[PDB]
């Protein structure tokens, strides 16, 4: 019946703690089925410095032990080694270790179904490495812990949904490592994500790599060599998938209601159209065994613990977890 | 003052058809416009009852034109054999006419007899058969006009974009990108913008890689040197900017123009806001505009080709002349 989201603290030297408490004070998050995984001592300490606003914090050992009520945040206490020793906005091994242990604990709760979705506050890669946790980044850490090779970034709005074959890599890199297997995988993830969120027979449009999907009313090299084989393979498997479509009309058409989702090829191909319309700025990592959301800012060490950080996107990313759980 | 020359393009295609239709519209009807094409084929077109009825007036010189509603002035650049013209066919005489109209318009423009050109589409196959070896409409003009460098501009009131490259594959674009070419397009943009009334243009340059870069070297190796060079010449240029916010910020008013790297970078944003079918070729000595349609040989001379684009193309050339 009831669906619960785990929220991970991230790097406690960053803005994670303060943006969670703030976000949780907002209507529709206040007293909601949410559990914070993080350092209880650190949360008490930030409240006492007046950073964090006033709220009752209740430790629980198990998710089921929560008694949800406005004005109470429930916490699975993963402790910082020395809470009194934490400095705002510096790279610290114990803060990177805590960040690691929270996402570890969150995925364990998800794996046994105590929690249905996860919203992650940001962590610092350099601190993670300093703690001896060797992962290329937050998302990759989630994927390793979860034994998921196959995941992709989703931008989710009412009117436009986009999943990316690739994100955060040079354009030359994207062109040189593009493969049929990857496109196929991402189409699969798109199909599964959309059914999980209640599209019984989703329409997926696949964007071309090249302008117009090619020149002179012919598909281009990637389109015919890589994309068409993935589309064809995916239709034969029962998926309602179209393309390759001209990049400069495909997102417009999905926006206008012709498709439920677009498979974008590279980062900017998907992010340009999302941001140009009225993005907030949250993303879903699709292809894990549970829904996971995060926001696009980082730890913001320069403004951590000053009351300047904005909790808007942390809030959006938590409400989104709840919706899609 | 400002007068605009309109070229016929390939007479077998939709050029003649849509020129006539568009010039019947309000704003274009009786406006300072000179068509350069074969009077005889425009006559033939008229007899077929596929257009509004209009009086055609042969002029040898632009100063002869007497602008009034319901009269289109033509500079008679004749087809070698007007009666032998078939619709939607690749014909040597048709491509040769397309070439002479362009040549003729550019001569008038270069001279100041006209202030802008708006082109109707031509057929490259037909152009090569007539012995004119040019890769296309735009390259033809660059040559006739001694302009090594030009770039495509998409022009709206709130968002304006110039392109380092267009149409080509992503890989081709990556492999043929250079600092020199970025410097050139920044300079074309600056010059274009002053020409349309921005005394001090503010120009943004889009990155190649997501977040204009740690991911790829074009920003530091190609884009930054070009921008540093632009700013040392007194231009107000920003970048490289994350492609996923720069067009948004241009749209909001932060920049007068964005220099896009490749086709979709500029076209995704423009189509998404709901704007066609037209562009400006910038970097020539005068304004040229055109629309994205080809000769449409399959529907030519039936009356079914849309003239809207062509009308916008001409309206824009007038505005900017």
**Distance set, CA B186 to CA A145, A196, B220, B250 (Å):** 48, 48, 17, 15
Pair B202, B238: CB distance under 8 Å: yes
Q: DSSP code of A216?
A: T
The rounded distance, in Å, linking the Cα atoms of A223 and A261 is 19
Buried-state track B222-232, b at ≥16 Cβ within 10 A, e below 16: bbbebbebbee
Q: Do A169 and B265 touch (CB under 8 A)?
A: no
Residue written as token pair 């989710």: A156
What does DSSP say about strands A261-264 and A282-286: parallel, antiparallel, or unpaired? unpaired
Mutation site, A276, A277, A278, A281, interface B, largest B CB count within 10 A: A276
Pair A80, A72: CB distance under 8 Å: no
Q: Identify the burial level of A308 via C-beta atoms within 10 angstroms of its C-beta, where 0-12 means exposed, 13-18 middle and 19 or more buried.
A: exposed
Q: Å from A289 to nearest chain B CA?
A: 28
Q: Report the chain B residue with the minimal C-alpha distance to residue A171.
A: B209
Q: What are phi and psi of B135, to 5 degrees?
A: -65, -20
> Does residue A63 sit in helix, strand or coil?
helix
Stated resolution in angstroms = 2.3
Chains A, B: CB pairs < 8 Å: 93
Domain ranges of chain B: 1-321
Contacts of A74 (CB under 8 A, 6+ apart): A34, A35, A36, A58, A59, A60, A65, A66, A67, A68
From A232, A149, A241, select the one nearest A194 (Cα to Cα).
A241
Candidates B211, B265, B268; nearest CB to A251? B268
Q: Å from B98 to nearest chain A CA?
A: 21
Pair A129, A96: CB distance under 8 Å: yes
Helix (H) or strand (E) holding B185: helix B179-195
Topology annotation, domain A1-325: Isopropylmalate Dehydrogenase (3.40.718)
Pair A18, A1: CB distance under 8 Å: no
Binding site membership of B for substrate: which residues?
A: 137-138, 271, 279, 288
Q: Do A273 and B273 touch (CB under 8 A)?
A: no
Q: Show residues of chain A in contact with B296, CB under 8 Å.
A: none
Number of H helices, E strands in chain A: 12, 12
The rounded distance, in Å, linking the Cα atoms of A296 and A25 is 21
Pair A39, A101: CB distance under 8 Å: no
CATH number, domain B1-321, options 3.30.565.10, 3.40.50.10140, 3.40.50.1980, 3.40.718.10 = 3.40.718.10
> Does residue A154 sit in helix, strand or coil?
strand
Question: Method of determination?
Answer: X-ray
């Amino acid at each position: 019946e009831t669906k619960t989201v785990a929220i991970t603290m991230g790097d406690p030297a960053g803005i994670g703690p303060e943006i969670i408490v703030k976000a949780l004070s907002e209507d529709g998050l206040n007293g909601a089925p949410l559990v914070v995984i993080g350092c209880l001592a650190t949360l008490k300490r930030l409240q006492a410095k007046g950073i964090t606003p006033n709220v009752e914090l209740r430790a629980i050992e198990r998710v089921a032990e929560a008694r949800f009520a406005p004005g109470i945040i429930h916490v699975i206490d993963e402790p910082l080694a020395q809470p009194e020793a934490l400095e705002a906005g510096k790279v610290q091994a114990q803060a990177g270790d805590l960040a690691y242990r929270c996402v570890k604990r969150a995925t364990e709760l998800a794996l046994r179904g105590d929690v249905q979705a996860i919203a992650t506050a940001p962590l610092n890669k350099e601190a993670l490495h300093l703690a001896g946790h060797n992962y290329p980044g937050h998302t990759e850490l989630l994927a390793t812990l979860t034994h998921s090779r196959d995941y992709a970034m989703v931008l989710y709005t009412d009117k436009l949904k986009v999943i990316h074959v690739s994100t955060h890599i040079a354009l030359r890199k994207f062109l040189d490592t593009l493969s049929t297997a990857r496109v196929e995988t991402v189409i699969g993830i798109a199909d599964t994500f959309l059914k999980r969120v209640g599209y019984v027979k989703p329409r997926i449009a696949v964007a071309g790599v090249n302008p117009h999907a090619g020149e002179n009313g012919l598909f281009g090299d990637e389109e015919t060599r890589i994309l068409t084989p993935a589309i064809t393979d995916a239709r034969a498997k029962g998926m309602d998938v179209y393309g390759p479509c001209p990049p400069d009309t495909v997102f417009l058409q999905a926006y206008e209601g012709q498709y439920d989702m677009v498979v974008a090829m590279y980062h900017d191909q998907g992010h340009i159209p999302l941001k140009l319309l009225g993005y907030d700025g949250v993303n879903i990592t699709a292809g894990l065994p549970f829904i996971r959301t995060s926001a696009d800012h980082g730890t913001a060490f320069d403004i951590a613990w000053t009351g300047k950080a904005k909790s808007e996107s942390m809030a959006v990313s938590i409400k989104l977890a709840m919706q899609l759980a």
